[PDB]
Amino acid sequence: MSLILDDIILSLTNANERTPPQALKTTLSLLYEKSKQYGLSSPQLQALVRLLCETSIIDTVTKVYIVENCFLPDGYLTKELLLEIINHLGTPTVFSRYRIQTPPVLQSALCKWLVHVYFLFPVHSEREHNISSSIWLHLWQFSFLQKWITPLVIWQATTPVDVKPWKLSIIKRCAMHPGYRDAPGSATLILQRFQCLVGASSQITESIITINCNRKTLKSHRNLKLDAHFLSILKRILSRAHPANFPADTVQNTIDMYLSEIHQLGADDSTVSLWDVTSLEQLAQNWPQLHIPNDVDYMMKPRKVMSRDSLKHLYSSIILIKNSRDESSSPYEWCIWQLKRCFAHQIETPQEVIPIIISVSSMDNKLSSRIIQTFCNLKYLKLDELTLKKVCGGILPLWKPELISGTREFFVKFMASIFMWSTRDGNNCTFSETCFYVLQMITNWVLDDKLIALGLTLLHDMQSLLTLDKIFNNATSNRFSTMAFISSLDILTQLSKQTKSDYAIQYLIVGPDIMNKVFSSDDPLLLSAACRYLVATKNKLMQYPSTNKFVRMQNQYIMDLTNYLYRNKVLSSKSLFGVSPDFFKQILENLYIPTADFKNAKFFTITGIPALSYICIIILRRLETAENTKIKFTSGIINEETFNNFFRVHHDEIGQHGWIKGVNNIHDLRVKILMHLSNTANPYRDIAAFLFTYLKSLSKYSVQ
Amino acid sequence: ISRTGLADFTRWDNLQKLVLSRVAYIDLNSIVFPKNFKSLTMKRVSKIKWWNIEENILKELKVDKRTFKSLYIKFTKFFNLRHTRIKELDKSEINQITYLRCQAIVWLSFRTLNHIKLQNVSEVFNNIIVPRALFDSKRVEIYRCEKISQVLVI
Amino acid sequence: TQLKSKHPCSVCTRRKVKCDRMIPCGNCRKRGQDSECMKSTKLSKEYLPDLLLFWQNYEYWITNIGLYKTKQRDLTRTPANLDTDTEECMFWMNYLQKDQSFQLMNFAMENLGALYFGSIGDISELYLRVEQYWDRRADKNHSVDGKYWDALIWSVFTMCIYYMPVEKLAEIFSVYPLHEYLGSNKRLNWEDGMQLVMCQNFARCSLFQLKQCDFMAHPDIRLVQAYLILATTTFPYDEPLLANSLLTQCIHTFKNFHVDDFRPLLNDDPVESIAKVTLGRIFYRLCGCDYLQSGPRKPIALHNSTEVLYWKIISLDRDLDQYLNKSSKPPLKTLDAIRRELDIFQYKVDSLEEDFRSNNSRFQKFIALFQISTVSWKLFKMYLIYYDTADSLLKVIHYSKVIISLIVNNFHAKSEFFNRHPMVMQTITRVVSFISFYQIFVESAAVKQLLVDLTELTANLPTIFGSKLDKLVYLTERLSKLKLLWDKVQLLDSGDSFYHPVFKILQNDIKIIELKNDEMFSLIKGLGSLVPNTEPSDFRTIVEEFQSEYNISDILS
Numbered sequence A: 001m002s003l004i005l006d007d008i009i010l011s012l013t014n015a016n017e018r019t020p021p022q023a024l025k026t027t028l029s030l031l032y033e034k035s036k037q038y039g040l041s042s043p044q045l046q047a048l049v050r051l052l053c054e055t056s057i058i059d060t061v062t063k064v065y066i067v068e069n070c071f072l073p074d075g076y077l078t079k080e081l082l083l084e085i086i087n088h089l090g091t092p093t094v095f096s097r098y099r100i101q102t103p104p105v106l107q108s109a110l111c112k113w114l115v116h117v118y119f120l121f122p123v124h125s126e127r128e129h130n131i132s133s134s135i136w137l138h139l140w141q142f143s144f145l146q147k148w149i150t151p152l153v154i155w156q157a158t159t160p161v162d163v164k165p166w167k168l169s170i171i172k173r174c175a176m177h178p179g180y181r182d183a184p185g186s187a188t189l190i191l192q193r194f195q196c197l198v199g200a201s202s203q204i205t206e207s208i209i210t211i212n213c214n215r216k217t218l219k220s221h222r223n224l225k226l227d228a229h230f231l232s233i234l235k236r237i238l239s240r241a242h243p244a245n246f247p248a249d250t251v252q253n254t255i256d257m258y259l260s261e262i263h264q265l266g267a268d269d270s271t272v273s274l275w276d277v278t279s280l281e282q283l284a285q286n287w288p289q290l291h292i293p294n295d296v297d298y299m300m301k302p303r304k305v306m307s308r309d310s311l312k313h314l315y316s317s318i319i320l321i322k323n324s325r326d327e328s329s330s331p332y333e334w335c336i337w338q339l340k341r342c343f344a345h346q347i348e349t350p351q352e353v354i355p356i357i358i359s360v361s362s363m364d365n366k367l368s369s370r371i372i373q374t375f376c377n378l379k380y381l382k383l384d385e386l387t388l389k390k391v392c393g394g395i396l397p398l399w400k401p402e403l404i405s406g407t408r409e410f411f412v413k414f415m416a417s418i419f420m421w422s423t424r425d426g427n428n429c430t431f432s433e434t435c436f437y438v439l440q441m442i443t444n445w446v447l448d449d450k451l452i453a454l455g456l457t458l459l460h461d462m463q464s465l466l467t468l469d470k471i472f473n474n475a476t477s478n479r480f481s482t483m484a485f486i487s488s489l490d491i492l493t494q495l496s497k498q499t500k501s502d503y504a505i506q507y508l509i510v511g512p513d514i515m516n517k518v519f520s521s522d523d524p525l526l527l528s529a530a531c532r533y534l535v536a537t538k539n540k541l542m543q544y545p546s547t548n549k550f551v552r553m554q555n556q557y558i559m560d561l562t563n564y565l566y567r568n569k570v571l572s573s574k575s576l577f578g579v580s581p582d583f584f585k586q587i588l589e590n591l592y593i594p595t596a597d598f599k600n601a602k603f604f605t606i607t608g609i610p611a612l613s614y615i616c617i618i619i620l621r622r623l624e625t626a627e628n629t630k631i632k633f634t635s636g637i638i639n640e641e642t643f644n645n646f647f648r649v650h651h652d653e654i655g656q657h658g659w660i661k662g663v664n665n666i667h668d669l670r671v672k673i674l675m676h677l678s679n680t681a682n683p684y685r686d687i688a689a690f691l692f693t694y695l696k697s698l699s700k701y702s703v704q
Numbered sequence B: 001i002s003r004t005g006l007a008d009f010t011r012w013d014n015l016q017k018l019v020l021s022r023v024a025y026i027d028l029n030s031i032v033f034p035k036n037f038k039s040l041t042m043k044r045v046s047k048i049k050w051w052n053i054e055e056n057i058l059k060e061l062k063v064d065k066r067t068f069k070s071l072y073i074k075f076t077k078f079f080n081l082r083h084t085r086i087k088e089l090d091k092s093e094i095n096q097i098t099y100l101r102c103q104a105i106v107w108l109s110f111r112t113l114n115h116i117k118l119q120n121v122s123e124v125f126n127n128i129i130v131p132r133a134l135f136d137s138k139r140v141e142i143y144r145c146e147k148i149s150q151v152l153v154i
Numbered sequence C: 001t002q003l004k005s006k007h008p009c010s011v012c013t014r015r016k017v018k019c020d021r022m023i024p025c026g027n028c029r030k031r032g033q034d035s036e037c038m039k040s041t042k043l044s045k046e047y048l049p050d051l052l053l054f055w056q057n058y059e060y061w062i063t064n065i066g067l068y069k070t071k072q073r074d075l076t077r078t079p080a081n082l083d084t085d086t087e088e089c090m091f092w093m094n095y096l097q098k099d100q101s102f103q104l105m106n107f108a109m110e111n112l113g114a115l116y117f118g119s120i121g122d123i124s125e126l127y128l129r130v131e132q133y134w135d136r137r138a139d140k141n142h143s144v145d146g147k148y149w150d151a152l153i154w155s156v157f158t159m160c161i162y163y164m165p166v167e168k169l170a171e172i173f174s175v176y177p178l179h180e181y182l183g184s185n186k187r188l189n190w191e192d193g194m195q196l197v198m199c200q201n202f203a204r205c206s207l208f209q210l211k212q213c214d215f216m217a218h219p220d221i222r223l224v225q226a227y228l229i230l231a232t233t234t235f236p237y238d239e240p241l242l243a244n245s246l247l248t249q250c251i252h253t254f255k256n257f258h259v260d261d262f263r264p265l266l267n268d269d270p271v272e273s274i275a276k277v278t279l280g281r282i283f284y285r286l287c288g289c290d291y292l293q294s295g296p297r298k299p300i301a302l303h304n305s306t307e308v309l310y311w312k313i314i315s316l317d318r319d320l321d322q323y324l325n326k327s328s329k330p331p332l333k334t335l336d337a338i339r340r341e342l343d344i345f346q347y348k349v350d351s352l353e354e355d356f357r358s359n360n361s362r363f364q365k366f367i368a369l370f371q372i373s374t375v376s377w378k379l380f381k382m383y384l385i386y387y388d389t390a391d392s393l394l395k396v397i398h399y400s401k402v403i404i405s406l407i408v409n410n411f412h413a414k415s416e417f418f419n420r421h422p423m424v425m426q427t428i429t430r431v432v433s434f435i436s437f438y439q440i441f442v443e444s445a446a447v448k449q450l451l452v453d454l455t456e457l458t459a460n461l462p463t464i465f466g467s468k469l470d471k472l473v474y475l476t477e478r479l480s481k482l483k484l485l486w487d488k489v490q491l492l493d494s495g496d497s498f499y500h501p502v503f504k505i506l507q508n509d510i511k512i513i514e515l516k517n518d519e520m521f522s523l524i525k526g527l528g529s530l531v532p533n534t535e536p537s538d539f540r541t542i543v544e545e546f547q548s549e550y551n552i553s554d555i556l557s
Helices: A002-014 A023-038 A042-054 A060-069 A079-088 A104-116 A129-139 A146-156 A165-176 A183-198 A202-210 A216-222 A228-241 A248-267 A280-289 A312-322 A330-344 A353-362 A365-375 A385-395 A408-425 A430-447 A452-466 A479-497 A515-520 A524-539 A549-567 A581-590 A599-603 A614-627 A640-649 A666-679 A685-694 B054-061 B096-108 B132-136 C026-031 C035-039 C047-064 C087-095 C098-107 C124-138 C144-163 C166-172 C176-182 C194-213 C222-230 C240-254 C270-292 C305-325 C337-347 C359-387 C390-409 C424-439 C445-459 C467-488 C501-516 C520-527 C540-549
Strands: B017-021 B025-027 B039-043 B047-049 B085-088 B115-119 B140-143 B150-153
Touching: A002 A023, A002 A042, A023 A060, A042 A060, A042 A079, A042 A104, A060 A104, A079 A104, A079 A129, A104 A146, A104 A228, A129 A146, A129 A165, A146 A183, A146 A248, A165 A183, A165 A202, A183 A202, A183 A216, A183 A248, A216 A248, A228 A248, A330 A353, A330 A365, A353 A365, A353 A385, A365 A385, A385 A430, A408 A430, A408 A452, A430 A452, A430 A479, A452 A479, A479 A524, A515 A524, A515 A549, A524 A549, A524 A685, A549 A685, A581 A599, A599 A640, A614 A666, A640 A666, A666 A685, B054 B096, C026 C035, C047 C305, C047 C359, C047 C424, C047 C501, C087 C176, C087 C194, C098 C124, C098 C144, C098 C166, C124 C144, C144 C194, C144 C222, C176 C194, C194 C222, C222 C240, C222 C270, C240 C270, C270 C305, C305 C337, C305 C359, C337 C359, C359 C390, C359 C424, C390 C424, C390 C445, C424 C445, C424 C467, C445 C467, C467 C501, C467 C540, C501 C540
Parallel strands: B017 B039, B025 B047, B039 B115, B085 B150, B115 B140
Antiparallel strands: none
């Protein structure tokens, strides 16, 4: 690609004095096509522009032609290439008589080239530009190239500082000089350009009127004629070399406005305050010169829009970019001081301060660590329960501490403080609500690869406290405790699905006798979670041996749950939830039933469980309306004694229509309601799904 | 050995002999062996937990453990050791079909094991159950086990 | 979204303000009525791949085993062989005459080529043996060497009659003397049954001579040669137990020679080197018959240009069917590997142009052409049955039509015995069962026209196989009735798996066949001293009605 183009330039440099008949022309001919195709990057141009002046074997006629045609730059052409051209520019003298003189026509052609590609010049560091501007002004005094650097000098000098009286004297004297024939035309535009920079400049208008001409040539001198073919290829070359850089439309536009500037001549650490900053684009230029006036009232108390208030929240952020964040930062102390006042109610009202500080404290997790660690105290809860609750919902689930990895021991003591606070108070239900946010935070710990075991250990201590008599009960309790517990089971269920986390399996496996509490409690939603957890657990624990503590308690759960749900053979079993079945018997004879045909079979089944008793009736009533049978089910509970008595009374009418089709007895009924319960989408589909797998009779109809 | 709870060697499909030395606590329930695993030798091990096989025999027998303690009855002269005592399950009380079921239970935890060796142990927190086939071939080596009280052969 | 019709809701065409094109209907969802959507045309996927996984187990335990290699016999009812009860074997020998047998040998010169040539070679020397056979009959003295040639020629006669056309049977044999012995009707001469019942009697004559020669104690190479001829006909499929025992003895006698490399040796004798070359083609046939007869019954297994080409073609088919019984998933790289050779070895099949003047060349070309077709169908069905590649659906259809038109092409130009080759059933039984199983779950127009011409092809086969023809149509009828039961009963969706009565039928179908191939019940009986809930609803009636109507024990003889 560009390596061969380097060789072509090197080919004209490696060989000298050969004087071939056509080999030199062929290399130049190869340079004609290679220059436009590959762009002649800046390092190549520096060697090429030095080669033309170094070697005089090639005629100056073709030296101008290659500058006009081959010099189509795609590179950055920094000041190093321009300095080499500046070295080529000049005239021989007594001091430089030994140095070979470059042709003046080649210098004029070279001066014509960078004018076309001035738009590609680097954005200067405003340190060597003063040297370059003086150099160009000194080079401007040569007549053969005065007509081409004159449009250039108009361009790089855009400031009142660049309008220097010593530069004014040189430009004016050349026009006043008789032996130029073009300086009065050249000086007039430069003086006009310098006029618009400094202002009125009554000294510059008295010089122009002395050097004024008939101004037809000035009109022609105002217009700068750049070759359209030169720019058309240049636009294509620039786009190809650098995609999404130097667009062709803007490259033509940038040249045009540089040309229009010449036409307009005839018609015509530094401290910057953050208070006055309004535009982010200006802020980008002001970034090296940004300075923040230290005022605490504003920088947090008032975006895609453009305004000073658009950068409002960014002001609190750019200072953290300007200087490293620290605990002594004024914005970081304002929130704590405002927070300190709001708990003590020394502020006017805490309601409006919270949303702004919460958003600030939502990010900057290292800062949020300081806020949470100091205000998580028992004493700070005594002042007001609601204000502690509000801040628990903002910064708890979004915090991931990595400073010491020893904050787990602080939470168990502090979490128990709220619980103990709720005991003697007598409930408020504020303990369960505060736990749910911690569970959200725990999953954030679980999501992170670090401290996976640390988070799981914290979760286990929650279940022991959550499963106490006063906070969790099947007789007198709150939905808050159960709804907090059902979310915890989903965390472990989701943890089982993840395979990228290689954690400790005893953490996933829940306690042996703690599942008797969840199973015995007749909360229909709670029982749904247990079936999901049991099914997901059995997906794992397959490589474990037949004899093991983890797999023995899992099989015990499956057998006990099915006996309590559908098997209806608890008495024949040896135990149920760690309780001997004969204990159940003793209660039964003490219980009274007006007509006890099958006393034992009514209580222990899917229909007899109080959690799933009435929802069983609801599904049946839906079936009766859909099928539109002759007789509806008048009873309120489904059991063996009601079903046969219902069929025995209407046995004459059973023979012709009976009941809903597809069912012959109660045993068929108990599944038919479950088929609908499994068919529809509802929270207790999970109950039927669990019972399908471990019923071996119905598993036959499934494939494999 | 089971620091992470579970220990397996299934991926080592060609493993045949495993040697454990200078380990404090080893539980055989957590360890999972491959299909061709045949020999297991342990030396200078502090604590050992044998396979938890006793209750599985109890369920099949449906006999109380205290009553089962009255069931067992006290070639081995070639390799008798004073440290332990050899006890066997009685054949008169157990039916032949029932006895065959009892032997099959023991082999459930003895899938492909052929050689077992005990050397310099300190305590075993359960009854030691070994099949009659491995014991009668002198492939059960309870050596320097002065702390082991009894071993049951079924 | 899966929109292929772009046709409006028919109920909603009444007021067609909008059409969301959603299933069942966006307008119906706004209307909240799915029943009204069902009343219209209006133009469930996770059960098809698992069932295709299950199909491989089904066809291995039904078509391959339980239809051909199964046999149920009770020793108590079966009468043992007694003295003076072998006169039927002698009667059939006396029925054959000296002149009649020579015409049989003349027919095998050009019509039975590429079958006998693999094992016995030319029959020119056999013409000398048959002349000696008639002379040896008069003499009372017999020799073991003489009896082996006696049994070998009788094996050839069984192969000749099984293959010669019915019209050539009339002028060679007189059916009248055969009526009074069999006791059957005199109205039928050679149409069906009579020709078949003649084949087994001659086949039993060949085995009787070996028992008369006491081959139990005298080993010879002719024992292997005789059996390989019996493998050309349908004899092994009729008595799977007899053929498996005979194959083991053939392997036992063959392994006594202990030949590692069968290539000719320059340092050995020229006749010995030649004898080792012709022993190579016998070994290849033994290896081929081992794979063709592979099953749970036989536990002992043993591991010129056209013969080697024929053998390694079966080796190509060996890799495909090894995954049928196992539940493992073959890797894709080896699964697509076979195709890159399947096309190059089908290019060498048609490399030999033809030779129309002799039927020997035509038959071998027909057999070779049939080999590639029956293994390409398996390879392309291999794509669908595990990977569900879209392009394989059409190719499976296309290759199945190739064997459809290949058999019917043989009925037009004096090649009616071309379709009597035993393995033509093996190819067609697998293709008619897969499409029938495919049509009960996926309905397509292309496959519908593919089933109608297959069931007629089975009825067009020659009626020399007999009972095996009647068993396959019954199996297809049972599969045809399943789609009548699949659509009538709605599919249940538990959320993770489907439950249908037809699935129970398929799973219970395999269990019964596996029960028949169980020797534990025979072991306890053979000793002679050690032998003396929660069913949901309305599904037992469906499954038991079909089980009572159609029983898989019917296809078992």
